[PDB]
Symmetry: D2
Amino acid sequence: PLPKTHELHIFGSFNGVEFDMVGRGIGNPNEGSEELNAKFTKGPLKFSPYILVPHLYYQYLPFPDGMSPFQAAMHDGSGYQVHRTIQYEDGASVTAHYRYTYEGSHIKGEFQVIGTGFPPDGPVMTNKLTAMDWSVTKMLYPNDKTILSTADCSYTTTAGKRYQSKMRENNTFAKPMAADILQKQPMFVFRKSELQHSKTELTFKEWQKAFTDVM
Amino acid sequence: PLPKTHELHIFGSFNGVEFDMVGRGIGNPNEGSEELNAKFTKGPLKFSPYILVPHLYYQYLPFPDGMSPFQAAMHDGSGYQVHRTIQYEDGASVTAHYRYTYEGSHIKGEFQVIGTGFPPDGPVMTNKLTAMDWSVTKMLYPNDKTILSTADCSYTTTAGKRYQSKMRENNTFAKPMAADILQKQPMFVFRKSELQHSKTELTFKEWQKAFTDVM
Amino acid sequence: PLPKTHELHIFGSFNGVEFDMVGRGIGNPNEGSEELNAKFTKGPLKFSPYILVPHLYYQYLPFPDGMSPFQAAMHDGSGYQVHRTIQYEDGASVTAHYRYTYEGSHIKGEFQVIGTGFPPDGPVMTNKLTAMDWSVTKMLYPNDKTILSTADCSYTTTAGKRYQSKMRENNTFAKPMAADILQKQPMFVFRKSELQHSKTELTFKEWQKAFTDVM
Amino acid sequence: PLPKTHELHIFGSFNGVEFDMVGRGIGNPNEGSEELNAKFTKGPLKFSPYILVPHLYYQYLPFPDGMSPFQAAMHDGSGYQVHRTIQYEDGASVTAHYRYTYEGSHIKGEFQVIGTGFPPDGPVMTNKLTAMDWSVTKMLYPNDKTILSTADCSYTTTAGKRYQSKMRENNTFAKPMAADILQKQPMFVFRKSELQHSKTELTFKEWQKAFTDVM
């Protein structure tokens, strides 16, 4: 089935210090929307919550004329895994690996996220990020089981200068993607994120829209 | 004025061998369309004409709310320059610098293009490129006179594998871009390109559309 | 103390397929030499064993004037972690995280290594790598607990063309590095690797030498 | 012949503003040493003179066992050209193309250098660079007429933080390099630079040493 609900377990470390968080949410797989709440297990994170945005569910993304490959792989249970790198302009790096299991229309995510090299005086460790800019991701299918996706990402900051990164990932499928997917390349995805947080929890929302054209 | 016609002069070298091209064309600055016919002046090209696509006029690009910064800088004569790098997956590199002069609605381009490190058995030197994929460019304005634009570009080939590149550029303006430009970031631009070529000449078309959103 | 023996548990996945290996060896921490042997647990590896070379112990590396920061962090038990990315020329990516424990002069490594996007017909998945070229890594210390290390790496192949990658890592220390280490930047490290393998096992050797100058 | 003297002409622009500089120097092609003096011809330099270091003569570099390919190509008159890109960590970029002519043991260089995207408050435009760090360049020979060279470069600054860049170039030869050069890869080159400057002139010195090994 298409998803209705999801849970998240995100674990790993930033600058060598372990973190762990759990959250739960819902979404609309016909519209590419999702929302998630996460209560901190033991006080605020030691870094900007905004750095978590890409790690806070492509199963909610439909494609223009049917299921996305993500949806198809959830629907038949065969699945996919995500392997992502993010290189930040101040020399920090994040690597991430997402695994999923499904229980009918419920998704369970197990996301390992490792970040290093964030300067102690930089905008991540001193909580100066204010929002993530809207993004366009480019997707290509080098083979029938593999998506390569790239985006140039940026956050606004309290200082007014943007904090930029390069995001690259593979999405690796256990079963080939369908011909209706592979025949249309590149596929782009527009994404909007919203995050609010307090000292004790965060709320996250994302809107995603796949497109081959705007003209 | 907004542009209606243009001429092209590309000069430089690929793998150490000089080339030169001249062309002329037209475009619609209200629709982001352009068309060019061109000829090689030092005999037949030693490399795939498709490599020239990005070098074959953002003055034809309107913005959603008004003139693009490119149009504004042509209209008041203050101008901009383009400084572009392209890094190809097989280790080749192109650097380019575009200068323009304006005569009413006519644009004169002087574009220096230098390419090196194209493998002699690669898809550029052996004419295996078949089309340029549609693209999305992301633009940010790190300061009021500078655009940073990035795109992940790809060509289809006869070998069935794409030929990928990273394109990056600064666009440097003599006068600040207007507030109605600076206020809207990121700005994306969708581009479609068509190229036909023979041993002596080519015909090129491009369609460009700026967007802040697709939702 | 300085290390004399080590073992390795390396695990993760390549192109979505899990692997797990254990190896053991020895090294000379006054000379920067080490050796490791490993049997394939459950049949041959599904990818070139040469891709494992950087993942197959800087505690064996002395510095030009005394202990390396790696050796100092082992001596006092405070330790360090390694977080590494490798980007290959054909679009594949590897991410890795190394954690260590110490029992006297014995090192235990737990290394998670995840690779994706290796083309099925490329040199890794078809076992065309023949050796790893000698390398120079550049090290800088952006802060007193963090090393940033970069190298441009290359393998020879059976086709007589090299297979290139960009390697980047942070080494994150629990305690600050000593002032005498921090004072000498950049620090370079020359490395030579040797690997032999059959269908059932591999044998690895590495020599490493730190240097600030060659003149 | 081997070179003994040289002249420099650098032309191009930084952040859209034209610059032009000429200088004269000497060197020792048996030792990999050179020195150059340049007086400022049209007023004070509008950016850190340290940014010019890589642009301020590989014909002075011998190889370990004989003439370098640069020296061979000068000596037989066939020559080489340099095509270089430098990407700086704050988003600035420099592209460069070096052409040479020879008059006996005298080199004449014509170097086009274009830089863009240097932040007006960054260390280049506010003269905070204090020295270029010693460097290691890695050279490979993808074909018998082409060198690909890479280096991770860094300057010290008055802020204490290093200013890093990625330098990449091709060196393209009119005639094949000697067979006795081509199988010894990678070839590394260690470089030390010194720059003295006043309001009216600069004096530059470089030492270069090729090496395949340090053990």
